[PDB]
From Swiss-Prot:
Assembly, per entry: Monomer or homodimer.
Name by which UniProt lists this protein: Phospholipase A2, major isoenzyme
Annotated Gene Ontology cellular component terms: cell surface; extracellular region
Subcellular location: Secreted
Residues with lipidation of kind N6-palmitoyl lysine: K56
Species, as recorded: Sus scrofa
Length: 124
């Protein structure tokens, strides 16, 4: 679920404010997305939107209000490493992995200030 994704980010990058840092960053990070991502970070964001798209398309997953962000799963954090619990259902595990791959991905992408609060209408 959304709050658990903010929290996995905080797991992978301990000195971060997720909403402050990665929301309205680039082409993608925020709501929807458009164009080509501006850098590796924005790309991480794009892959995550795609990862959620795929999930919405498993016939066997029907999310509350159609939003995978409402879906709680089980995971834990340990010395920087995120684990998705194996006992998540197939739907819960898919979301858990999207969030997981996006947190790690974030943690490795360079952070370019010029790209936070981008004029998307113009560059996206
Ligand atoms: Ca997005
Ligand atoms: Ca659940």
């Amino acid at each position: 679920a959304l709050w658990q994704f903010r929290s996995m980010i905080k797991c992978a990058i301990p000195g971060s404010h997720p909403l402050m840092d990665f929301n309205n960053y680039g082409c993608y990070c925020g709501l929807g997305g458009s164009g080509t991502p501006v850098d590796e970070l924005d790309r991480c964001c794009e892959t995550h939107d795609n990862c959620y798209r795929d999930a919405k398309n498993l016939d066997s997953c029907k999310f509350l209000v159609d939003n995978p962000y409402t879906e709680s799963y089980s995971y834990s954090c340990s010395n920087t490493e995120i684990t998705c619990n194996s006992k998540n259902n197939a739907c819960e595990a898919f979301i858990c992995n999207c969030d997981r791959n996006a947190a790690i991905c974030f943690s490795k992408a360079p952070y370019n200030k010029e790209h936070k609060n981008l004029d998307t209408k113009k560059y996206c």
